[PDB]
Amino acid sequence: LRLPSPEVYRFVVKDSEENIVFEDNLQSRSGIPIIKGGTVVKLIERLTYHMYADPNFVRTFLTTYRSFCKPQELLSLLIERFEIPEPEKRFRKEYVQPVQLRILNVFRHWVEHHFYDFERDLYLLERLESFISSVRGKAMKKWVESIAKIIRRKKQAITFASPPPPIEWHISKPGHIETFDLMTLHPIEIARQLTLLESDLYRKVQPSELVGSVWTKEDKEINSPNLLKMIRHTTNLTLWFEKCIVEAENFEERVAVLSRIIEILQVFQDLNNFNGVLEIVSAVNSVSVYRLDHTFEALQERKRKILDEAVELSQDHFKKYLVKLKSINPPCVPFFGIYLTNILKTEEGNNDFLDLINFSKRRKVAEITGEIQQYQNQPYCLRIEPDMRRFFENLNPMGSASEKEFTDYLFNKSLEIEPRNPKQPPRFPRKSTFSLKSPGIRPN
Q: Quick one: 265 and 410 in the same domain? A: yes
Query: Domain check: are 202 and 111 in the same one?
Result: no
Residue 94 within any structural domain of the chain: yes
Instruction: Pick the last residue of a domain from 99, 121, 156.
Output: 156
Residues 6 or more apart from 70 whose CB is under 8 A from it? none
Sheet of strand 35-38, all strands in order from the earlier edge strand to the far edge: 20-22, 35-38, 357-358
End-to-end CA distance of the chain: 78
Is residue 410 a part of any domain in this protein? yes
Q: Nearest 5°: phi and psi at 37?
A: 180, 180
Q: Are 273 and 382 in contact (CB under 8 A)?
A: no
Residues 6+ apart with CB under 8 A from 410: 239, 242, 243, 246, 286, 288
Q: Which of 96, 127, 156 is the last residue of a domain?
A: 156
Contact (CB, 8 A) for 228 and 221: yes
* Angstrom distances, CA of residue 80 to CA of 16, 99, 110, 170, 375: 21, 12, 17, 64, 38
Domain-ending residue, one of 106, 126, 156: 156
203 in the same domain as 82 = no
What is the tally of structural domains in the chain? 2
What CATH number is given to the structural domain containing 95? 1.20.870.10
DSSP type of residue 22: E
Alpha-carbon distance of 65 to 54, in angstroms, equals: 16
> Per DSSP, which regions of 109-172 are E strands?
none
Classify 21 as helix, strand or coil.
strand
With a CB cutoff of 8 Å and minimum separation 6, the contacts of 417 are: 246, 248, 249, 251, 254, 292, 425, 426, 428
Same domain, 126 and 270: no
Q: Residue 283: which CATH number?
A: 1.10.840.10
- How was this structure determined? It was done by X-ray
H-run or E-run covering 248: none
> Is 233 in contact with 201 (CB distance < 8 Å)?
yes
What domain range is 240 assigned to?
A: 177-337+372-417
DSSP symbol at 96: I
State whether 314 and 406 are in the same domain: yes
> β-pairing, 20-22 with 35-38?
antiparallel
CB neighbour list of residue 81: distance below 8 Å, 6 or more residues apart: 11, 44, 45, 48, 99, 103
150, 199: one domain:
no
My answer on whether 201 and 308 are in the same domain is yes
- Is 128 in the same domain as 277? no
Same domain, 192 and 127: no
Distance CA(6)–CA(20), nearest Å, equals 15
Same domain, 138 and 249: no
Alpha carbon distance 14, 5 (integer Å):
11
Give yes or no for a contact between 281 and 313, defined as CB atoms under 8 angstroms apart. yes
Examine the domain organization and report whether 291 and 231 are in the same domain. Answer: yes
* Cα–Cα distance, 354 to 361 (Å, whole number): 10
